[PDB]
Amino acid sequence: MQIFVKTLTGKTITLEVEPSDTIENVKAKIQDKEGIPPDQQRLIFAGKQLEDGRTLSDYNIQKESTSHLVLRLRG
């Protein structure tokens, strides 16, 4: 499935993922496109920060017809 990530400029990128993928795995894909290491990424979905050891399904991100996440820089 596809997800959209609002980057630090207010623009977006797209990632291809699976619902059971871990948050850490998603951050690795964001690092590939944006050059921000996973330890400096904060991902927000539906107002909640996503935890590295959790999966996308833990947050029901796949239930939305369009999956919208927001990237913030730690610090």
Numbering used by the authors: 1 to 75
Relevant lines from the article:
Therefore, we mutated Leu67 to Ser with the prediction that it would encourage β5‐strand slippage to place residue 67 in the Ser65 pocket, and fill the Leu67 hydrophobic pocket with Leu69 instead. Indeed, 1H‐15N BEST‐TROSY 2D spectra (bTROSY) of 15N‐labelled Ub L67S showed 73 peaks implying a single Ub conformation. The chemical shift pattern did not match wt Ub, but more closely resembled the pattern seen for the phosphoUb‐CR conformation. The structures highlight important consequences of the Ub‐CR conformation. The Ser65‐containing loop (aa 62–66) protrudes from and lacks defined contacts with the Ub core, is flexible judging by B‐factor analysis and in Ub L67S adopts distinct conformations in the two molecules in the asymmetric unit. Consistently, in a large‐scale mutational study in Saccharomyces cerevisiae, the Ub L67S mutation was shown to have detrimental effects on yeast growth (Roscoe et al, 2013; Roscoe & Bolon, 2014).
The Ser/Thr protein kinase PINK1 phosphorylates the well‐folded, globular protein ubiquitin (Ub) at a relatively protected site, Ser65.
